[PDB]
Enzyme design. Structure first.
Site, PDB file in Angstrom:
ATOM      1  N   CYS A 104      69.592  73.376  18.781  1.00  0.00           N
ATOM      2  CA  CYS A 104      68.862  72.984  19.996  1.00  0.00           C
ATOM      3  C   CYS A 104      69.721  73.169  21.252  1.00  0.00           C
ATOM      4  CB  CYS A 104      68.209  71.586  19.812  1.00  0.00           C
ATOM      5  SG  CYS A 104      66.927  71.247  21.065  1.00  0.00           S
ATOM      6  N   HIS A 124      67.514  76.056  21.708  1.00  0.00           N
ATOM      7  CA  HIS A 124      66.210  75.689  22.238  1.00  0.00           C
ATOM      8  C   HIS A 124      65.847  76.650  23.369  1.00  0.00           C
ATOM      9  CE1 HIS A 124      62.907  73.468  24.044  1.00  0.00           C
ATOM     10  NE2 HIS A 124      62.823  72.918  22.840  1.00  0.00           N
TER      11      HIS A 124
END
EC number: 3.1.2.-
Length: 186
Positions: A104, A124
């Site tokens: 992420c 992400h």
């Protein structure tokens, strides 16, 4: 048994911390949840409070680990990025040819510590611009990206796939398939 170091900083994403810890332990990996600041409980990004197994300072004395895992979370990744101790751990892990895994916003700590430049990585979507500033990596949209010993993934909803990729890398496809079977994964 394989061994994993998960570095837990204030503001870490709790789901991106707990899913890999739990899935790795289901695979028989000995996981140390190491608190960046010390041994005290860590307030995560959505206020879940996780009690670390050890301080990072003590977890360092028990290396080496077969994988070092970096969860995301905006503030957690910032804290990992600002830590000289994290820099040393990641550099040592890279130099000993050990796996590093980050999810992420976690991969932006690789950028901060100059880890794995030239690797193909994912993050992400919202962390792409930060990760790609300076052009030190090649970007990927894959839900999990493994380029040699740099393993990255995108978000809470890829955490199962991220964790099983770690299990496959350490313990093989068979063990990863055993762990996957009862998870009721989609």
């Amino acid at each position: 048994s394989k061994r994993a170091l998960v570095i837990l900083a204030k503001g870490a994403e709790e789901m991106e911390t707990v899913i890999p810890v739990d899935v790795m332990r289901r695979a028989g990996i000995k996981v140390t949840v190491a608190g960046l600041a010390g041994k005290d409980p860590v307030q995560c990004s959505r206020d879940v409070v996780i009690c670390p197994d050890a301080s990072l300072e003590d977890a360092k004395k028990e290396g080496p680990y077969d994988v070092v895992v970096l969860p995301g979370g905006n503030l957690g990744a910032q804290n990992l990025s600002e830590s000289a101790a994290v820099k040393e751990i990641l550099k040592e892990q890279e130099n000993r040819k050990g796996l590093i895994a980050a999810i992420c916003a976690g991969p932006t700590a690789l950028l901060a510590h100059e880890i794995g430049f030239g690797s193909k990585v994912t993050t992400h979507p919202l962390a792409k611009d930060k990760m790609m500033n300076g052009g030190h990596y090649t970007y990927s949209e894959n839900r999990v990206e493994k380029d040699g010993l740099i393993l990255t993934s995108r978000g809470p909803g890829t955490s199962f796939e991220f964790a099983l990729a770690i299990v496959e890398a350490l313990n093989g496809k068979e063990v990863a398939a055993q762990v996957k079977a009862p998870l009721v994964l989609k």
